[PDB]
């Protein structure tokens, strides 16, 4: 609810779209396919907004 600093936040994944939103769809598909033996979801940041 601070439209002033919203862009500067969304770029640093402080508040904004979720991890599986901004990523390229191909990369999301790849992460889903190889979740079992080579994890990737821990690499990326996922924001939570109260």
């Amino acid at each position: 609810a601070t439209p002033s600093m919203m862009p500067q936040w969304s770029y640093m994944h402080i508040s904004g779209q979720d991890a599986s939103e901004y990523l390229s769809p191909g990369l999301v598909q790849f992460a889903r396919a190889t979740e079992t033996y080579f994890s990737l979801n821990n690499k990326f940041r996922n924001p939570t907004v109260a």
């Binding site: 979720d18 996922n46 924001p47 939570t48 907004v49 109260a50």
Partner: peptide, 15 residues
Amino acid sequence: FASLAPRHTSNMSGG
């Protein structure tokens, strides 16, 4: 409603 979420029986026996 729904603009509230943090956006990103036990009786005696019942096994």
